Amino acid sequence: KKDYRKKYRKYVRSRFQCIEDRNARLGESVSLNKRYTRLRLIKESPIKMELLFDPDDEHSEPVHTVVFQGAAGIGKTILARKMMLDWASGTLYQDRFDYLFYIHCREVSLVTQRSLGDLIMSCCPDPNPPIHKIVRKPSRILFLMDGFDELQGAFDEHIGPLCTDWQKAERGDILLSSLIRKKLLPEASLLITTRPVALEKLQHLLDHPRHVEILGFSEAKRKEYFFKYFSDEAQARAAFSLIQENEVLFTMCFIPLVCWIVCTGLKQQMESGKSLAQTSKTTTAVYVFFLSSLLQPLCAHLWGLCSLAADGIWNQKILFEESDLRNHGLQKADVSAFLRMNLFQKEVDCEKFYSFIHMTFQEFFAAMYYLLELPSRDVTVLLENYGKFEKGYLIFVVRFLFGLVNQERTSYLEKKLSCKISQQIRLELLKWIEVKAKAKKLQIQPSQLELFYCLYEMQEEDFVQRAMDYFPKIEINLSTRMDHMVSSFCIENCHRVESLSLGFLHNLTSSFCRGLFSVLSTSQSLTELDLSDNSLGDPGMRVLCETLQHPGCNIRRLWLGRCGLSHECCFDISLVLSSNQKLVELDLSDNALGDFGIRLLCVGLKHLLCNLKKLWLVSCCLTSACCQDLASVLSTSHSLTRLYVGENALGDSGVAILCEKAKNPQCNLQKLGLVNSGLTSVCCSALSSVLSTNQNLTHLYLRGNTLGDKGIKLLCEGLLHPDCKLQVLELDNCNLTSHCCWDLSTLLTSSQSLRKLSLGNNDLGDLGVMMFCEVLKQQSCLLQNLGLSEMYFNYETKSALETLQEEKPELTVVFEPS
Amino acid sequence: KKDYRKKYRKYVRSRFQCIEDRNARLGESVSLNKRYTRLRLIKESPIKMELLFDPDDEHSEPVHTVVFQGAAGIGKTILARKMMLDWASGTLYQDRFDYLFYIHCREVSLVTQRSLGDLIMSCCPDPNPPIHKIVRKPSRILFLMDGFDELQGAFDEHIGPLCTDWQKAERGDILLSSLIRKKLLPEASLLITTRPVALEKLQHLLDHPRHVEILGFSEAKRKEYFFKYFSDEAQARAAFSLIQENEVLFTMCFIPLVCWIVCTGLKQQMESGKSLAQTSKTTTAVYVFFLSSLLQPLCAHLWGLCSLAADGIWNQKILFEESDLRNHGLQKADVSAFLRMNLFQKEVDCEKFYSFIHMTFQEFFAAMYYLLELPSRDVTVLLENYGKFEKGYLIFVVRFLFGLVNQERTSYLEKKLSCKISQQIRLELLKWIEVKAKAKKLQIQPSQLELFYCLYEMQEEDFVQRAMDYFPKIEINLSTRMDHMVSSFCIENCHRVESLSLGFLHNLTSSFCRGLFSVLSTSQSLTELDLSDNSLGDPGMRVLCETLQHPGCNIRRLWLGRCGLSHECCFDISLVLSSNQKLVELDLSDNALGDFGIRLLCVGLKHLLCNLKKLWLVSCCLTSACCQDLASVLSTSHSLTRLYVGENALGDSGVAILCEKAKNPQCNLQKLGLVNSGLTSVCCSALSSVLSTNQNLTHLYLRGNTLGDKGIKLLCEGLLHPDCKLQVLELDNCNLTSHCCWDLSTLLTSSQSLRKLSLGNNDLGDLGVMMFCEVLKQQSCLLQNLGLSEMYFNYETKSALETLQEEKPELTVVFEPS
Ligand SMILES: Nc1ncnc2c1ncn2[C@@H]1O[C@H](COP(=O)(O)OP(=O)(O)OP(=O)(O)O)[C@@H](O)[C@H]1O
Ligand SMILES: Nc1ncnc2c1ncn2[C@@H]1O[C@H](COP(=O)(O)OP(=O)(O)OP(=O)(O)O)[C@@H](O)[C@H]1O
Ligand SMILES: CC(C)(O)c1coc(S(=O)(=O)NC(=O)Nc2c3c(cc4c2CCC4)C=CC3)c1
Ligand SMILES: CC(C)(O)c1coc(S(=O)(=O)NC(=O)Nc2c3c(cc4c2CCC4)C=CC3)c1
């Protein structure tokens, strides 16, 4: 007859019409989900809400879990609400799921015992839905869990009694684990929204999740928001222009919540006949401006509320009863005012409790508590409990505290912050940074990012510059405009930073990094810049190359990784080499800088006053052709001493060119990086001439080649020469056999210059090694690692090797295989 | 980063380079697996090592278990080692298995408790491989179990506590059972090598194995072995030729272990400047020649070693410690000499124990122990424990004892055998043969094969000829040249054998059997030769037919089975019939001897002095056309009395021809085998004429025809004739119905000649039987089986049948259906 499934879709469609889905909607108006602004979704390329659980391009395996992550206040909930509306309307997943259930984490009781009644409680008023029929069929139901990080009370991931069978009642935390792990109602599809910081407590439940990141609004959508928010286009234009002119506030407003806070304040200024001026620069300033603007016209009850918020955070309470309001002196006065204003809501979805409009607001209020004039009111305790899931990580409580603790304060609630208290806290906050800044560890506690966002908020020179003294090495990751804004601010004020590592995330290949590179080049302490494995295309390298020509750079070491740089960029690299007399080490490996790029690079390398000493051209798609220019550089330049060119196609016909010039008596080559070049015995006579002539050559790296016995014999003849000064010889994957052990024995016996000789996976067997063991006792000069890498020997050889280590202590490393 | 799988692949490639994979390699040289000689592999057509675990041509089912069987020293291990090398090199199963684990059974502790650490212990020195990750994934791993029959200690197949879950520890015997049965680490692939004798203790674990037999070297491969073994072509040629001239030693060298022991002894004769002469004829001769040659130059410690070997076999010990050597007086003298020579090895694969170079050698030493001058030194005990898995079956200990117990002994250790002891044993060995020879049973104890191999080794006329007196019937299976050599020798010396059955295995259709057939035809006791179901094509039949013409044959009965003989061979069969006046019974059924072949066969059958009495032409693709020649044979020959021609197409139009001549009053036909000929009622008037005319006809077999009531009625008219002498009438599948019961009742009532009348699956029902029950009481002459085959009746009929049996005792078999 009447199919509940249809009744449920009607319920969902009609229910989720409001954006907030809570009261105090500026006179209880309808905000309309029709105003939904599209979010930028990136998968780990863009992703849509459609096809989230579908198989991808290979193996054709299904997806059971998709997790949405991002910053707070970015519409994770709103995206879920749009999804529910589109599903109910029959436009989204209309051919995939029979039922869609939404479970908010805020309302979940973690410590109480219940059966899986979530499918009843989250749906229609009808107390008897067909749970035992179609609604229990696996794979036909889609669930969404909103706010994993908002789960209150104790929580654990490693629970024996997981609880399967939806019919049985168990603790709420346990029940959630079983559903997330797909042990309860298996094959069900589940969407989870969470802050990245809480992923560490979720990853154990997910096993193999699909990862989707939610990004903020683009400039195009920022304008759209104002025009949809303000019904009068003239107001939308004024509101948009005002904020657009404020680069910092505009950027922060990329976060939908910040945009909302700002738009609401401007609307109120309009209604009140005010100038609509707004000078906020920090996240704190946005929250302080909004709160004081709304209460100023109330303010008398700020204490009772801040105490409530602090008690709420400490005791893991988000949803409050009338008793909790009364216990803080909040009754029949400010509560009503708070509900009239966009500050608090009374939760009108057929329930009986009160709540803050946002968790960032509750944390903001708690932050204010610690500065006014009641769980503790001790910032030491606040900071110590930062690294905890149960307390909600307290990211904003502390970050707002940083911004709030200042001297440059005015009226509008900012005068209610006690001076002595703020001063005592300021000192504690700086010490906190020192302790965490020195902790180079990966965890939920600050990852050397949050410390900088906190310092950005506390935009004061004395405090900020002192904090920077605890960051001699900075390792950070930038994904948006606000991150670069914070990074540039913080690094600009660093006078004691020696090295910086910058990770770049989908924002790349553009001028977006100019605002940071421009700053780095003016640093008087930065020596090493690490840009490894960042997709910065030629345009990114060009911006860097422009900044690397600044006379005040002081940068001595520049490292690149799998950036995909093209041969074209060698034009700009050469321009840097020709004028930057400070650069010593330049690693251009793992790029597409083919023979042409090298031809151009060599222009800078041969340039007068070019002081580059170490050059890595490893894995640069090079052939033997480039050896003509590289050989010219080594001969021409007095500064090049280290050259690595392996993982290319510089075979015997190529190295012969390098050798012709490398052998020059005036050659300054110290390390010859002929690793994976595919060399054989043919060029070994050329190497012999180099080793016996160039007395500055101390290290050979010949791993990856196929020299054979003939090749090593020819090299030995060179190494046996009186004028050979080679100290380190690496012979691992050189395809040598036991037949050459006689030449290696001769080398060990007669060589005087070698200090390290490492033999790797060669077919020397027991004969070669046993022979060496005896030879090495005959007044040998070899004191370093013998090699023996990836080898298996018999008992007697193993005994001889261990014996050698004990009988001749001057040999530091025999390196037995095990 | 670094994948263990790759590190392991490297380990396996570097490890398995030697053939022996043990020391004492003639100066510790490298034998090189590169010298591997291809083995002949036959599946139960040739098979390759590739695709062993793949599905075949139907059902597309996977193979989890593959079992390799063959002679001791046939290269089961070396094949396994080559497999590992080819896999590690990425040429064999490179796209099927990620890991390959080799577990030797010799090193397995059956009685101790352990987890499945075999995946750690069998690999590289690294103590912490990723067992809990990729290495525990089912179906991605191939295991090889080498030497099931070498498992020491107690063992059982029917164990409740099989032990699943690789993480849990249990007894080694139990652990192996679970892995073999695929209960532990299920869906894994396992290759098992074992001696055929031990299959009986493995079959319970395998359930549904793929069977591959390993055969020895061909003549061409033997040449290659010598030319690869001896680096000097001149020496390889002289060495090969020496052996080629020795037919018996040459034949034995089909086993890699035999060609090895022969080549090794010769190499030493070469180095020592000797004549290189070798006169060995038996396996024992080769083993003692080798051992004595090596020790003669030592011999003083033969006692202590033989005692050790005997103690080892008795107490199930293969791997010995220094304590076991010392306890037998073996210390700092001969042990070193034994390790220098190819006799003993000290197991140098990072271990601490000693072992015999070959298991057949350890058993050889034990065999000598019993003859010298300490577990027992009682041959009675040795022989009694032959039929035991735990003791290793003791096949060679006893077989070598047979060869060693002789009078024709010389120096070179053969003089260390005590005369009195050998004489006492010789008597016990002969009695042992008597006891086992009379035991016509299938088991691990001698299957009437090993007894003959033992007698071959003991090549002495008195002992051997006496042994033959216990084999009046010989049933043997020959698969190789050495089997024919032994069979020929043994049967040649049989003076009291009445019948011989020969199974021929892939060796067929060739002259390979000539060496045996030539001997059988000279036997003065052999009467019956059974060659059933052997693929001996016309060439095989021709060789037989040549030997069947020998005047001393004395063969009276020759039986053929599904041999696939062609009509062409009837020419040679006829040649035998025309001159062999002794042959009485010739069964040519289940062949392709169609009408043409019969036309030719009939030439011999009609030949003067052809005494063949019983001829079977059943299932010979015959039609009614052949009846013209068969009828001529029956009329022409005075000797043919029994003719079976069913399972052909000799329908009514055919039998009418046979009847025209069979009815002749001078006809000597006694049994008319017209079974499955497709006859009906039409020819029954012709059969009637035969019955009433030929008084020598006593048996009719009409099963398979479709006569109906009319057909049997017509036969009854013949049977009711005063001159009909038929005694036995078989009427089973004749398609008769209840309507004929009155003619059968008339037949029973009036027939005087019948003694047996068997009615089978005819629709006679309860009425027919009830009628017969009463008729049979009226002074009936029917005393034999009434039939009632595949019939079902009601209560009253059953009662009448049982009553009949009791009331009229002269009726031997009522044959109630149940
Ligand atoms: N795509 C969007 N279109 C319009 N408004 C949006 C959008 N995304 C976010 N917002 C704004 O976000 C505010 C609601 O904040 P919200 O409840 O989503 O914070 P939240 O982080 O999702 O809560 P939670 O942590 O439980 O998921 C509303 O003012 C709404 O207008
Ligand atoms: N295909 C082959 N090519 C070369 N030599 C072979 C080959 N097969 C066997 N051999 C010889 O086998 C000898 C080693 O004896 P082996 O260990 O194989 O006896 P085994 O019966 O396999 O031991 P196990 O009973 O444990 O399997 C070596 O001398 C080797 O030359
Ligand atoms: C990208 C990164 C640094 O790695 C990260 C991952 O997760 C986090 S977060 O949990 O601390 N979220 C936030 O800070 N949001 C947030 C921010 C600002 C202002 C507001 C909010 C919330 C509404 C007001 C200013 C930029 C960050 C940060
Ligand atoms: C196939 C059959 C006949 O059914 C069978 C009966 O017994 C067995 S066996 O498993 O015990 N193997 C052996 O005897 N090998 C073996 C043989 C010879 C010489 C030697 C060996 C071992 C090295 C020296 C001569 C032929 C058999 C198999």
The 3-state secondary structure of A457-486, one letter per residue: HCCCHHHHHHHHHHCCEEEEEECCHHHHHH
Contact predicate B299/B415, CB 8 Å? no
User: Which residues, 6+ apart, have CB-to-CB distance to A148 below 8 Å?
Assistant: A105, A192, A193, A194, A198, A201, A202
User: By the 8 A CB rule, do B226 and B200 touch?
Assistant: no
| Shortest Cα–Cα distance, B540 to chain A (Å) | 55
Cα(A425)–Cα(A402) distance, integer angstroms = 9
Question: Is residue B673 helix, strand or coil?
Answer: strand
Q: Rounded to a whole number, what is the distance in angstroms from the first to the last CA of chain B?
A: 75
Is residue B254 lining ligand 2, measured as CB closer than 6 Å? no
Question: Which residue from B1, B3, B23 is spatially nearest to B11, judged by alpha carbons?
Answer: B3
Cα–Cα distance measured from residue B325 to residue B304, given in angstroms and rounded to the nearest whole number: 9
- Of A629, A630, A532, residue with least CA distance to A589: A532
**B93: which residues sit within 8 A by CB, 6+ positions away?**
B50, B87, B100, B142
Question: From the list A761, A792, A817, which residue is nearest B15 (CB)?
Answer: A792
**Cα(A140) to centroid(ligand 1), Å:** 28
Whole-angstrom CA distances from A544 to A548, A605, A617 are 6, 18, 19
Nearest to B559 by CA among B485, B602, B635, B618: B618
Which helix (DSSP H) or strand (DSSP E) does residue A614 occupy? strand A614-616
DSSP string, A290-311: HHHHHH---GGGHHHHHHHHHH
What are the φ/ψ torsions at residue A72 (nearest 5 degrees)? -70, 150
Report yes or no: A284 and A405 within 8 Å, Cβ to Cβ.
Answer: no
Contact A245, A207 (CB under 8 A): no
End-to-end CA distance of chain A, in Å?
75
The DSSP symbol for B148 reads G
Among A17, A18, A19, which residue has the most ligand 1 atoms within 8 Å of its CB, making it the best to mutate? A19
CA dist., res. B368 & res. A771, Å (int): 43
Token pair recorded at residue A365: 């209020």
- The rounded distance, in Å, linking the Cα atoms of B247 and B326 is 43
Tell which one of B395, B444, B475 to mutate to probe ligand 4, the residue whose CB is within 8 A of the most ligand atoms.
B395
Quote the Cα angle for A670-A675-A680, to 5°: 110
* CA A429/CA A437 separation, integer angstroms: 12
Contact between residue A175 and residue A116 where contact means Cβ atoms under 8 Å apart: yes
Which residues on B lie below 8 Å from A763 (Cβ)?
14
Distance CA A150, CA A316 (A): 9
Residue type, A202: L
Q: Which two tokens stand for residue B365?
A: 């030493």
Question: Which segments of B315-385 does DSSP mark as H helices, in order?
Answer: 322-326, 334-340, 359-369, 379-384
What is the spatial distance between Cα B293 and Cα B775, in angstroms, rounded to a whole number? 87
A818: nearest CB among B14, B126, B348: B126
Please name the residues in contact with A283: beta carbons below 8 A apart, sequence gap of 6 or more.
A252, A258, A399, A400, A403, A457
Report which of B702, B659, B721, B710 is spatially closest to residue B681, judged by C-alpha positions: B710
Q: DSSP H helical segments within A493-550, as ranges?
A: 514-520, 538-547
Give, using CA atoms, the residue closest to atom 3 of ligand 3.
A449
- Copy the structure tokens of residue A732: 């691992």
Closest CA to B40 of B483, B477, B502, B479: B479
Contact call for residues B799 and B766 (beta carbons, < 8 A): no
Residue to mutate among B29, B32, B124, B351, with most A CBs inside 10 A, is B124
Please name the residue that has the structure tokens 């050189």.
A734
Q: CA A288 to CA B146: how far, in whole Å?
A: 79
Interface probe with A: pick from B121, B350, B352, B354, most Cβ of A within 10 Å? B350
Supply the DSSP symbol for B39: P
Q: DSSP letter at B495?
A: S
- The C-alpha atoms of residue A307 and residue A305 are separated, in whole angstroms, by 5
Q: Across the interface, do B14 and A791 touch by the CB < 8 Å criterion?
A: yes
Ligand 1 in reach of A72 Cβ (< 6 A): yes
How far, in Å, CA of A764 to CA of B30, rounded? 12
What is the full DSSP assignment across B705-773? ---HHHHHHHHHHHHTSTT----EEEESSS--BGGGHHHHHHHHHH-SS-SEEEE-S-BTHHHHHHHHH
Note whether B485 and B514 are within 8 A (CB): no
Q: How far out from the chain centre does Cα B46 lie? A: 19
> Chain B closest CA to A795's CA: distance in Å?
6
Burial class for B281, CB neighbours closer than 10 Å (0-12, 13-18, 19+)? middle
Question: CB neighbours of B375 closer than 8 A, spacing ≥ 6?
Answer: B310, B311, B314, B315
- Name the one residue in this structure whose structure tokens are 């070598």: B400
Pocket of ligand 4 from Cβ distances under 6 Å: B 71-73, 195-197, 252, 255, 257-258, 283, 360, 395, 449-450, 482-483
d(CA A145, CA A147): 7
8 Å CB contact of B348 and A795: yes
Secondary structure (3-state) at A535:
coil
Alpha-carbon dihedral sign for residues B779, B785, B788, B793: positive
- Which chain B residues have a beta carbon less than 8 Å from that of A798? 350
Q: What six digits make up the tokens of A440?
A: 């180079």
Give the C-alpha separation, B316 to B320, whole Å.
Answer: 11
B63 and B54 in contact (C-beta within 8 Å)? yes
Ligand nearest to the CA of B447: 4
Spatial strand order in the sheet of B528-531: B473-478, B499-504, B528-531, B557-560, B585-587, B614-616, B642-644, B671-673, B699-701, B728-731, B756-759
Question: What are residue B171's DSSP bridge partners?
Answer: B113
CB contact under 8 A, A792 and B349: no
Strand partners, A65: A190
Q: Residue A569: which of A520, A534, A612, A536 has the closest Cα?
A: A536
- If one residue of A283, A402, A480 were mutated to test the ligand 3 pocket, choosing by the most ligand atoms within 8 A of its CB, it would be A283
Judging contacts by C-beta atoms under 8 Å, the chain B residues touching residue A796 are 348
The protein residue whose alpha carbon is closest to atom 2 in ligand 1 is A37
* A742 within 8 A of A768, measured Cβ to Cβ: no
One-letter amino acid identity for B182?
K
3-state SS assignment for residue B571: helix
Judged by its nearest atom, the ligand closest to the C-alpha of residue A41 is 1
The CA-atom distances, in angstroms, between B235 and each of B141, B267, B268, B276, B732 are 45, 9, 12, 10, 73
Contacts of B124 in chain A (CB under 8 A): 792, 818
Yes or no: say if B25 and B18 are a contact pair by the CB < 8 Å rule: yes
B511 DSSP 8-state letter: G
Residues whose CB falls within 8 Å of the CB of residue B616, separated by 6 or more in sequence, listed in order: B586, B587, B588, B589, B644, B673
Q: Are strands B210-215 and B40-43 parallel, antiparallel or unpaired?
A: antiparallel
Q: CA angle A221-A227-A230, nearest 5°?
A: 135
> Which residue type does B457 have?
E
* Distance separating alpha carbons of residues A200 and A316, to the nearest angstrom: 19
**β-sheet with A99-104: strand ranges across:** A40-43, A210-215, A65-69, A189-194, A141-146, A99-104
Task: Map residue A145 onto helix, strand or coil.
Answer: strand
Of all ligands present, the nearest one to the C-alpha of A20 is: 1
Q: How far is the CA of B377 from the centre of ligand 3 (A)?
A: 89
**d(Cα A726, Cα A671) in Å, to the nearest integer?**
10
Q: Of the candidates A654, A709, A714, A669, which has an alpha carbon nearest to the alpha carbon of residue A689?
A: A714
Burial of B488 (C-beta count, 10 Å sphere; 0-12/13-18/19+): buried
DSSP structural state of residue B149: G
Strands B728-731 and B170-171: unpaired
- Residue B76 among known ligand-binding residues: yes
List Cβ neighbours of A619 (8 Å cut-off, separation of 6 or more). Answer: A589, A590, A591, A647, A648
Q: How far apart are CA A707 and CA A717, in angstroms?
A: 14
Ligand 2: residue of B77, B194, B197 to mutate (most ligand atoms within 8 A of CB) is B77
Provide the Cα torsion A182, A185, A186, A188; round to 10°.
-90
At how many degrees (to 10) do helices B283-295 and B359-369 cross? 90
Q: Which amino acid is at B603?
A: V
Q: What ligand is nearest to the CA atom of residue A148?
A: 1
What does the block give as tokens for A241?
């222009």
Q: Ligand 2, residue B39: give the atom nearest the CA.
A: 1
The answer for residues whose C-beta is within 8 angstroms of residue B724's C-beta and 6 or more apart is B691, B692, B695, B718, B751, B753
Answer yes or no: do B10 and A765 touch at CB < 8 A.
no
Query: What is the Rg, in whole angstroms, of the alpha carbon atoms belonging to chain A?
Result: 34
At CA A428, angle to CA A422 and CA A432, rounded to 5?
135
Q: Using DSSP bridges, classify how beta strands A728-731 and B113-114 pair: parallel, antiparallel or unpaired.
A: unpaired
Find the largest Cα–Cα distance for chain B. 102
Measured between beta carbons, the chain A residues lying within 8 angstroms of B348 are 794-796
Letter string b/e over residues B25-49, b meaning 16 or more CB atoms within 10 A of that residue's CB:
eeeeeeeebeebbebbbbeeeebeb
Query: What was the resolution (in A) of this experimentally determined structure?
Result: 4.3
CB-count burial class (<10 Å; 0-12, 13-18, 19+) for A426: buried
Query: After which residues is the backbone of chain A broken at C–N > 2.5 Å?
Result: 44, 297, 373, 507
CA distance A152 to B110: 56
- Contact call for B14 and A792, based on CB within 8 A: yes
Closest CA to A403 of A309, A251, A488, A285: A285
Q: Which two tokens stand for residue B725?
A: 């002498």
Q: What is the Cα–Cα distance from B262 to B249, expressed in whole angstroms?
A: 9
A398: tokens are 């502390």
List the beta bridge partners of residue B344: B356
Torsion sign (Cα): A537, A542, A547, A553: positive
Residues in chain A: 818
When scoring A737, A738, A766, A792 by the number of chain B Cβ atoms within 10 A, the one with the most, hence best to mutate, is A792
Q: Give me the torsion for CA of B308, B309, B313, B314, rounded to 10°.
A: -40
Query: What angle do helix axes B627-636 and B652-662 make, rounded to 10 degrees?
Result: 10
Of all residues in chain B, what percent are helix, strand and coil, respectively (each to 5)?
45, 10, 45
**What gap in Å lies between CA B399 and CA B451, rounded to an integer?**
9
Question: Which amino acid type is present at position A540?
Answer: G
Among all chains, which residue has been given the structure tokens 């029973």? B748
Phi, psi of B488 (to 5 degrees): -60, -50
* Residue B43, H or E segment: strand B40-43
**Cα(B287) to centroid(ligand 4), Å:** 14
10 Å CB burial of residue B356 (0-12, 13-18, 19+) is: buried
SS3 B399: helix
Q: How far apart are CA B560 and CA B563, in angstroms?
A: 7
C-alpha angle A764-A766-A767 in degrees, rounded to nearest 5 = 75
Q: Which residues of A486-509 are buried (b: 16+ CB within 10 A; e: fewer)?
A: bbbbbbbbbeebebbebebeeebb
Contact call for residues A677 and A705 (beta carbons, < 8 A) = yes
Is A193 a pocket residue for ligand 1 (Cβ < 6 Å)? Answer: yes
3-state secondary structure of B788: coil
- Ligand 3 pocket residues where CB is under 6 Å: A 71-73, 195-197, 252, 255, 257-258, 283, 360, 395, 449, 479, 482
Q: What is the DSSP letter of A107?
A: G
Atom 1, ligand 4: residue with shortest CA distance: B71
Question: Which residues 6+ apart lie within 8 Å of A727 measured at CB?
Answer: A698, A699, A753, A754, A755, A756
- Contact A268/A235 with Cβ under 8 angstroms? no
Atom 23 of ligand 1 has which residue's CA nearest to it? Answer: A77
d(CA A126, CA A121): 10
Tokens of B249: 């030693």
Asked if residue A67 lies in contact with residue A202, where contact means CB atoms within 8 angstroms, the answer is yes
What dihedral angle (degrees, nearest 10) is formed by the CA atoms of B119, B122, B127, B128? Answer: -30
Which strand ranges, in their side-by-side order, compose the sheet holding B40-43?
Answer: B40-43, B210-215, B65-69, B189-194, B141-146, B99-104
Sign of CA dihedral A7, A10, A14, A17: positive
The region that residue A39 occupies, defined by phi over 0 for left and psi between -120 and 50 for alpha, beta otherwise, is beta
Q: Which two tokens stand for residue B152?
A: 């020491």
Q: Give residue B59's identity as a one-letter amino acid code.
A: H
Beta strands B642-644 and B614-616, pairing class: parallel
Whether the CB-CB separation of A375 and A315 falls below 8 Å is answered with: yes
Decide: A258 and A267 in contact? Cβ < 8 Å: no
DSSP tag of A372:
B
Work out whether strand B528-531 and strand B499-504 pair parallel, antiparallel, or are unpaired: parallel
φ, ψ of residue A525 to 5 degrees: the values are -120, -20
Check if the beta carbon of residue B793 is closer than 8 Å to that of residue B766: yes
3-state SS class at A441: coil
Q: How far apart are CA B129 and CA B642, in angstroms?
A: 76
Query: What length is written for chain B?
Result: 818
**Which of B318, B447, B306 lies closest to B374, judged by CA?**
B306
> In B521-637, which residue ranges form alpha helices assigned H by DSSP?
538-547, 570-577, 595-605, 627-636
